RNA sequence: AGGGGAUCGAAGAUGAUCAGAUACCGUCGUAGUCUUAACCAUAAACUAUGCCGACUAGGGAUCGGGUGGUGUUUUUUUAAUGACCCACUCGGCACCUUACGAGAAAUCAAAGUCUUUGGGUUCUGGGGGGAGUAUGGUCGCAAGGCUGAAACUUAAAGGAAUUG
RNA sequence: GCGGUAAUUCCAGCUCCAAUAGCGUAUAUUAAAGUUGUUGCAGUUAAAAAGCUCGUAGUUGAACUUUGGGCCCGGUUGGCCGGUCGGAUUUCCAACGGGGCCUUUCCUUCUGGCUAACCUUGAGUCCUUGUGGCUCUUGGCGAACCAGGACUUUUACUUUGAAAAAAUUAGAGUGUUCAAAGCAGGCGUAUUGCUCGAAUAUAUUAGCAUGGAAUAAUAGAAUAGGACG
RNA sequence: GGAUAGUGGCCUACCAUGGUUUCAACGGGUAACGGGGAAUAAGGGUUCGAUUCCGGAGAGGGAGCCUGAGAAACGGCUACCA
């Protein structure tokens, strides 16, 4: 989520060991590192064009993506730089030979390279433990908004 | 179709609904309340051993006429006080007050036998030996 | 309101038979109804039928003989796993020697024997004898 | 009964049925061309009106609405198509 | 059928097989579409138009002689109203019914009807809302509705 | 209803309704077999020589015996008019 | 809580009746009975029969709508009307006869299309008594409403039809 | 249900039954029980439809969009021969299935690598009068999949498969004297060894991998903020 | 940042206001260790598993710790309670 200020903490936000020599007069001020997480996920330009710092970003930060790759729909965006998705699924009861609707809510970190709204289907990649509960990271937005601009005024 | 949802996802309704109506089953409710362990003289166990308080003379129910010869027993593990039947001709001669006896069920899932009213148990042994053997002659009652 | 459109068609057919009749106008037809009516016809239980064309959902006239005892629908299309098909026909077919459970697989609406011969499975539709 | 033709039923029994239970449903209303010889031209009118239809030039009348078919007004003619 | 009553009335236009034609219909697309918009401009409802165009003129169905439902022709010419027509006529009813209930607190049956009317409103809205014709967050409110219809 | 090697097993293959082709089973003591006689050149009813039809008790029970008879005979050649396939 | 309080009339008092007669029958008559403002939320609130959809069988009446007619009656100058009549067609409240079918039966055009058992969905029951009792929760000014057990007891309670 | 004086139920004697190195009893549970009912219950009168309607969660929800037709390839059972020294394969034939084509038909897509395949043909020919047959390089198939870039509406179902403890369970082999078992054992030159075993199946719900495209969902282009260049 | 073998509200500062729930959160009960499995045989089920194998937990109850590669060990120590 981040937005504005970027240098808004008590500590200086920077990328580890990405020294920029001040002697060397340069036109871009800050040298910035990045990668592609692989598995086929484009490292969106807003990660390379970005100036945010998030060490928990899978493109600009020091996290690796491995283990389960999951999709689920976004249902909470109130946590600064993280969200809560719901993954629905039917569950088979034998004896009755039918299923029942179930769900779980997975908490997952979301880098300022994505701009996620409630309702967006999102794909996340499993993580090293990143917080008390978050074990996933938003790796791609599948959605958009859900035709919001096609909710405008009158003729 | 009457009642029961036929749907392909209605499993949850279908289970819950059952859960609910199992309670109308006398054995399922008994099991889960633990009526066995809670109420009921015996611990839940099959027999239990107590001490003889008074020799009684229960008069049978109609259309029977009899005096039915029983013992009030105080269950050892329990203190709970219970009246028990002493079967076969005599045998009330075998017991005596303050003697130990091994009570057992009557084979009716709780519930009294026939014309004996109130009695839900029967005597099986006294002073560690067995009414049955005593009744015959295969064994003898212990010292004191 | 109208639930399984296959249900009404099947039912109407059965009552036309039971009343000793030789035709049913059925409504409102559907891909699935034809493909079902199609499998009966393939095996003798009805005659020829006819799609009439109101510019709506359709009507079908079925001509039937009397070879047919019952043709029901399985109201929730349960899944069937190549082995459970044994257990289905066993439950609702009068003998091992004839009669068909018709169902729906990835490779088309087909009776259980063509289903067994092609070695595919899927969901369960209805049945014929 | 027991055996008949559902496909090609008699014109008359089909005729008497409800407009929704015919073999393929259709209307049973019609349109007409109406005159009131003060004028020379002819408005096209639907057999069922709701709107009390007025003629081209003169505020005259034509028909009044009813429960079904409109009551045409006094001195008028009509063909059907 | 019949949502808010135990009525079982079947009753509807029985549309013709003839998806085109009438053949004896002269005029033209041009002819009628203009006729639509002029009436839409008088403030007529697409329904009112169809009816008016049905009897007086020979417009068997507007969608035929022009492959286009009357409402879409209106939208296309900018004549579409804020909220849909049926939605409108429901609200307008609940406003008259309410006005009556203010004036007659003793009428329990009005109270009962209002519920019904409003239930239908509230449900209809949510359909329209779902399919984006009404802004997500639209809402019929008793207070505000009277200013809404008029 | 054959067997392992050919061999007609299981007795009594029953009759059948000419109207409905349902089985005409034994205790159906309400069904009927109608023998319509073959005629020759100028009257003359040719004893023992019929066109026959069998109608299940059910069918006569339902009253459909006289209509279904008509259809059968007519479209078999011994009526012309009387019946109409359409209604 | 105001009003109203003709009538009939819980309660009460009586006259008779009775072995008794706190009753039935008669008299007096408080509350009530009506109304406004507010509560209460229960009736054998019953069709003791959930709603939506389909299919399966005959008949005559009737209620509302409609359509058809060189129908009757209304006179005037024919109509126009209206009322009536006859055939159909939707949707009503019902009755009749059958019953392919269903049921333990009485009976049932649904209580049918069910061991040839699956259109969709809601709710309730699981022997009898204990008992709609105890308890907690909750609603109510109250009376009471909703939710609502167990111990213990018991071999039947019950339904429909038959003969007495 | 028997017993209140001829007790077919008690207490015995005799005789008789059932199971028998075992048989009774008490408690629990399972079958019977379609008396918990998904399969599969019952609710007019037997226990049971909420006084009534509205209504959210929940479950459920009409029809309609590549169908039809033509061509090739190669299988596995079965027949009628058997050619052959019990099983064999070609032609004849049906039958049931898998693959790929062309019918206006994305197969994600470009940039080579690769080619197995004929529109080829370059010669002609073993041999039945020849399209019966495969070797065979010099113009002319993509997809069979490598790998790099650039992107991809979501699901449910079902298929085959991988990964997978043993003992238990099902079950093959083996004569523990039989058997419950066990996993041994079997053959000779029984003086100097020979040898078969120690299978298979189930292993589901979830996860992974692959084939399918019916049934059932989902998203798409209407203030064009559309689609291809 | 500190701590740890190391991720992590694990702990601490600062900052924010979030996380779960009728698809049953939270709470209560269990005469609850979980599995491999056991009992019952048309099928669907119903009941059971302290107990020969795998996992986990404990050593009268709690806490703490020394040694050590490995223990918060108990046929090790220290303390409190019994
Ligand atoms: Mg926050
Ligand atoms: Mg109860
Ligand atoms: Mg006492
Ligand atoms: Mg103790
Ligand atoms: Mg409704
Ligand atoms: Mg209707
Ligand atoms: Mg209408
Ligand atoms: Mg008064
Ligand atoms: Mg009195
Ligand atoms: Mg007196
Ligand atoms: Mg009194
Ligand atoms: Mg009540
Ligand atoms: Mg009544
Ligand atoms: Mg009728
Ligand atoms: Mg008329
Ligand atoms: Mg008795
Ligand atoms: Mg004697
Ligand atoms: Mg004797
Ligand atoms: Mg004896
Ligand atoms: Mg035994
Ligand atoms: Mg099932
Ligand atoms: Mg029952
Ligand atoms: Mg009752
Ligand atoms: Mg009711
Ligand atoms: Mg559908
Ligand atoms: Mg598998
Ligand atoms: Mg093995
Ligand atoms: Mg932190
Ligand atoms: Mg807070
Ligand atoms: Mg619950
Ligand atoms: Mg425990
Ligand atoms: Mg265990
Ligand atoms: Mg357990
Ligand atoms: Mg224990
Ligand atoms: Mg330990
Ligand atoms: Mg100890
Ligand atoms: Mg503590
Ligand atoms: Mg320790
Ligand atoms: Mg020790
Ligand atoms: Mg130790
Ligand atoms: Zn005019």
mmCIF file of N, CA, C and O in Angstrom, chain C residues 64-105:
data_model
loop_
_atom_site.group_PDB
_atom_site.id
_atom_site.type_symbol
_atom_site.label_atom_id
_atom_site.label_comp_id
_atom_site.label_asym_id
_atom_site.label_seq_id
_atom_site.Cartn_x
_atom_site.Cartn_y
_atom_site.Cartn_z
ATOM 1 N N UNK C 64 -44.198 -43.646 -29.136
ATOM 2 C CA UNK C 64 -43.708 -44.831 -28.427
ATOM 3 C C UNK C 64 -44.618 -46.045 -28.568
ATOM 4 O O UNK C 64 -45.822 -45.919 -28.752
ATOM 5 N N UNK C 65 -44.006 -47.217 -28.442
ATOM 6 C CA UNK C 65 -44.631 -48.504 -28.729
ATOM 7 C C UNK C 65 -45.319 -49.167 -27.546
ATOM 8 O O UNK C 65 -46.503 -49.487 -27.603
ATOM 9 N N UNK C 66 -44.559 -49.380 -26.478
ATOM 10 C CA UNK C 66 -45.032 -50.146 -25.349
ATOM 11 C C UNK C 66 -43.946 -51.049 -24.802
ATOM 12 O O UNK C 66 -44.177 -51.766 -23.834
ATOM 13 N N UNK C 67 -42.761 -51.022 -25.410
ATOM 14 C CA UNK C 67 -41.658 -51.860 -24.940
ATOM 15 C C UNK C 67 -41.126 -51.327 -23.613
ATOM 16 O O UNK C 67 -40.360 -52.000 -22.928
ATOM 17 N N UNK C 68 -41.558 -50.120 -23.255
ATOM 18 C CA UNK C 68 -40.974 -49.359 -22.160
ATOM 19 C C UNK C 68 -41.767 -49.476 -20.865
ATOM 20 O O UNK C 68 -42.985 -49.277 -20.848
ATOM 21 N N UNK C 69 -41.064 -49.810 -19.784
ATOM 22 C CA UNK C 69 -41.673 -49.874 -18.461
ATOM 23 C C UNK C 69 -41.491 -48.551 -17.733
ATOM 24 O O UNK C 69 -42.461 -47.964 -17.240
ATOM 25 N N UNK C 70 -40.242 -48.088 -17.669
ATOM 26 C CA UNK C 70 -39.931 -46.839 -16.977
ATOM 27 C C UNK C 70 -38.706 -46.110 -17.551
ATOM 28 O O UNK C 70 -37.742 -46.751 -17.987
ATOM 29 N N UNK C 71 -38.757 -44.776 -17.558
ATOM 30 C CA UNK C 71 -37.584 -43.966 -17.893
ATOM 31 C C UNK C 71 -37.401 -42.765 -16.945
ATOM 32 O O UNK C 71 -37.812 -41.647 -17.259
ATOM 33 N N UNK C 72 -36.760 -42.989 -15.799
ATOM 34 C CA UNK C 72 -36.552 -41.924 -14.832
ATOM 35 C C UNK C 72 -35.298 -41.073 -14.986
ATOM 36 O O UNK C 72 -34.379 -41.393 -15.750
ATOM 37 N N UNK C 73 -35.280 -39.980 -14.223
ATOM 38 C CA UNK C 73 -34.160 -39.054 -14.151
ATOM 39 C C UNK C 73 -33.542 -39.089 -12.759
ATOM 40 O O UNK C 73 -34.254 -39.221 -11.761
ATOM 41 N N UNK C 74 -32.215 -39.010 -12.697
ATOM 42 C CA UNK C 74 -31.488 -38.970 -11.425
ATOM 43 C C UNK C 74 -31.238 -37.514 -11.037
ATOM 44 O O UNK C 74 -30.435 -36.812 -11.655
ATOM 45 N N UNK C 75 -31.953 -37.068 -10.011
ATOM 46 C CA UNK C 75 -32.256 -35.651 -9.878
ATOM 47 C C UNK C 75 -31.057 -34.790 -9.560
ATOM 48 O O UNK C 75 -30.936 -33.713 -10.163
ATOM 49 N N UNK C 76 -30.175 -35.220 -8.618
ATOM 50 C CA UNK C 76 -28.888 -34.531 -8.645
ATOM 51 C C UNK C 76 -27.930 -35.375 -9.487
ATOM 52 O O UNK C 76 -27.782 -36.575 -9.234
ATOM 53 N N UNK C 77 -27.325 -34.766 -10.502
ATOM 54 C CA UNK C 77 -26.374 -35.473 -11.338
ATOM 55 C C UNK C 77 -25.115 -35.783 -10.534
ATOM 56 O O UNK C 77 -24.127 -35.057 -10.612
ATOM 57 N N UNK C 78 -25.174 -36.848 -9.735
ATOM 58 C CA UNK C 78 -24.036 -37.294 -8.931
ATOM 59 C C UNK C 78 -22.867 -37.590 -9.820
ATOM 60 O O UNK C 78 -23.039 -37.925 -10.993
ATOM 61 N N UNK C 79 -21.674 -37.508 -9.259
ATOM 62 C CA UNK C 79 -20.509 -37.958 -9.980
ATOM 63 C C UNK C 79 -20.371 -39.464 -9.849
ATOM 64 O O UNK C 79 -20.775 -40.059 -8.846
ATOM 65 N N UNK C 80 -19.827 -40.088 -10.885
ATOM 66 C CA UNK C 80 -19.648 -41.528 -10.887
ATOM 67 C C UNK C 80 -18.227 -41.872 -11.303
ATOM 68 O O UNK C 80 -17.724 -41.341 -12.289
ATOM 69 N N UNK C 81 -17.576 -42.759 -10.565
ATOM 70 C CA UNK C 81 -16.149 -42.976 -10.766
ATOM 71 C C UNK C 81 -15.809 -44.336 -11.368
ATOM 72 O O UNK C 81 -15.270 -45.189 -10.671
ATOM 73 N N UNK C 82 -16.105 -44.544 -12.650
ATOM 74 C CA UNK C 82 -15.794 -45.797 -13.364
ATOM 75 C C UNK C 82 -16.027 -47.123 -12.594
ATOM 76 O O UNK C 82 -16.211 -48.167 -13.208
ATOM 77 N N UNK C 83 -16.011 -47.100 -11.268
ATOM 78 C CA UNK C 83 -16.241 -48.305 -10.504
ATOM 79 C C UNK C 83 -17.635 -48.259 -9.922
ATOM 80 O O UNK C 83 -18.317 -49.287 -9.848
ATOM 81 N N UNK C 84 -18.066 -47.059 -9.529
ATOM 82 C CA UNK C 84 -19.368 -46.872 -8.890
ATOM 83 C C UNK C 84 -20.526 -47.152 -9.876
ATOM 84 O O UNK C 84 -21.639 -47.461 -9.453
ATOM 85 N N UNK C 85 -20.257 -47.060 -11.178
ATOM 86 C CA UNK C 85 -21.246 -47.409 -12.193
ATOM 87 C C UNK C 85 -21.833 -48.816 -11.970
ATOM 88 O O UNK C 85 -23.015 -49.055 -12.232
ATOM 89 N N UNK C 86 -21.006 -49.739 -11.487
ATOM 90 C CA UNK C 86 -21.475 -51.078 -11.150
ATOM 91 C C UNK C 86 -22.583 -50.963 -10.147
ATOM 92 O O UNK C 86 -23.647 -51.540 -10.302
ATOM 93 N N UNK C 87 -22.313 -50.176 -9.116
ATOM 94 C CA UNK C 87 -23.225 -50.020 -8.008
ATOM 95 C C UNK C 87 -24.477 -49.248 -8.437
ATOM 96 O O UNK C 87 -25.558 -49.494 -7.926
ATOM 97 N N UNK C 88 -24.359 -48.340 -9.396
ATOM 98 C CA UNK C 88 -25.559 -47.665 -9.862
ATOM 99 C C UNK C 88 -26.487 -48.637 -10.547
ATOM 100 O O UNK C 88 -27.510 -48.968 -9.977
ATOM 101 N N UNK C 89 -26.133 -49.136 -11.726
ATOM 102 C CA UNK C 89 -27.034 -50.048 -12.453
ATOM 103 C C UNK C 89 -27.617 -51.146 -11.557
ATOM 104 O O UNK C 89 -28.773 -51.537 -11.712
ATOM 105 N N UNK C 90 -26.813 -51.612 -10.605
ATOM 106 C CA UNK C 90 -27.229 -52.646 -9.685
ATOM 107 C C UNK C 90 -28.396 -52.170 -8.856
ATOM 108 O O UNK C 90 -29.266 -52.950 -8.500
ATOM 109 N N UNK C 91 -28.427 -50.879 -8.557
ATOM 110 C CA UNK C 91 -29.476 -50.346 -7.696
ATOM 111 C C UNK C 91 -30.779 -50.113 -8.437
ATOM 112 O O UNK C 91 -31.850 -50.259 -7.868
ATOM 113 N N UNK C 92 -30.703 -49.778 -9.715
ATOM 114 C CA UNK C 92 -31.913 -49.329 -10.386
ATOM 115 C C UNK C 92 -32.222 -50.004 -11.743
ATOM 116 O O UNK C 92 -33.062 -49.524 -12.514
ATOM 117 N N UNK C 93 -31.584 -51.140 -12.004
ATOM 118 C CA UNK C 93 -31.871 -51.908 -13.204
ATOM 119 C C UNK C 93 -32.302 -53.322 -12.858
ATOM 120 O O UNK C 93 -31.629 -54.006 -12.086
ATOM 121 N N UNK C 94 -33.424 -53.767 -13.453
ATOM 122 C CA UNK C 94 -34.167 -55.000 -13.149
ATOM 123 C C UNK C 94 -33.381 -56.303 -13.264
ATOM 124 O O UNK C 94 -33.772 -57.289 -12.648
ATOM 125 N N UNK C 95 -32.309 -56.315 -14.042
ATOM 126 C CA UNK C 95 -31.491 -57.511 -14.193
ATOM 127 C C UNK C 95 -30.164 -57.160 -14.840
ATOM 128 O O UNK C 95 -30.008 -56.086 -15.429
ATOM 129 N N UNK C 96 -29.201 -58.060 -14.744
ATOM 130 C CA UNK C 96 -27.902 -57.745 -15.279
ATOM 131 C C UNK C 96 -27.933 -57.858 -16.783
ATOM 132 O O UNK C 96 -27.096 -57.285 -17.461
ATOM 133 N N UNK C 97 -28.910 -58.566 -17.327
ATOM 134 C CA UNK C 97 -28.826 -58.892 -18.741
ATOM 135 C C UNK C 97 -29.256 -57.792 -19.710
ATOM 136 O O UNK C 97 -28.800 -57.797 -20.841
ATOM 137 N N UNK C 98 -30.116 -56.861 -19.307
ATOM 138 C CA UNK C 98 -30.550 -55.802 -20.230
ATOM 139 C C UNK C 98 -30.649 -54.461 -19.530
ATOM 140 O O UNK C 98 -30.047 -54.281 -18.482
ATOM 141 N N UNK C 99 -31.395 -53.516 -20.101
ATOM 142 C CA UNK C 99 -31.655 -52.238 -19.447
ATOM 143 C C UNK C 99 -30.426 -51.348 -19.368
ATOM 144 O O UNK C 99 -29.304 -51.841 -19.306
ATOM 145 N N UNK C 100 -30.611 -50.031 -19.384
ATOM 146 C CA UNK C 100 -29.457 -49.133 -19.373
ATOM 147 C C UNK C 100 -29.591 -47.986 -18.406
ATOM 148 O O UNK C 100 -30.651 -47.363 -18.270
ATOM 149 N N UNK C 101 -28.480 -47.721 -17.732
ATOM 150 C CA UNK C 101 -28.268 -46.448 -17.072
ATOM 151 C C UNK C 101 -27.579 -45.541 -18.072
ATOM 152 O O UNK C 101 -26.529 -45.880 -18.617
ATOM 153 N N UNK C 102 -28.199 -44.408 -18.350
ATOM 154 C CA UNK C 102 -27.604 -43.472 -19.264
ATOM 155 C C UNK C 102 -27.047 -42.377 -18.386
ATOM 156 O O UNK C 102 -27.629 -42.081 -17.364
ATOM 157 N N UNK C 103 -25.902 -41.812 -18.753
ATOM 158 C CA UNK C 103 -25.288 -40.769 -17.942
ATOM 159 C C UNK C 103 -24.575 -39.722 -18.826
ATOM 160 O O UNK C 103 -24.763 -39.729 -20.037
ATOM 161 N N UNK C 104 -23.775 -38.832 -18.239
ATOM 162 C CA UNK C 104 -23.087 -37.791 -19.010
ATOM 163 C C UNK C 104 -21.611 -37.749 -18.753
ATOM 164 O O UNK C 104 -21.190 -37.453 -17.644
ATOM 165 N N UNK C 105 -20.821 -38.005 -19.782
ATOM 166 C CA UNK C 105 -19.381 -37.983 -19.630
ATOM 167 C C UNK C 105 -18.749 -36.911 -20.480
ATOM 168 O O UNK C 105 -19.414 -36.275 -21.298
#
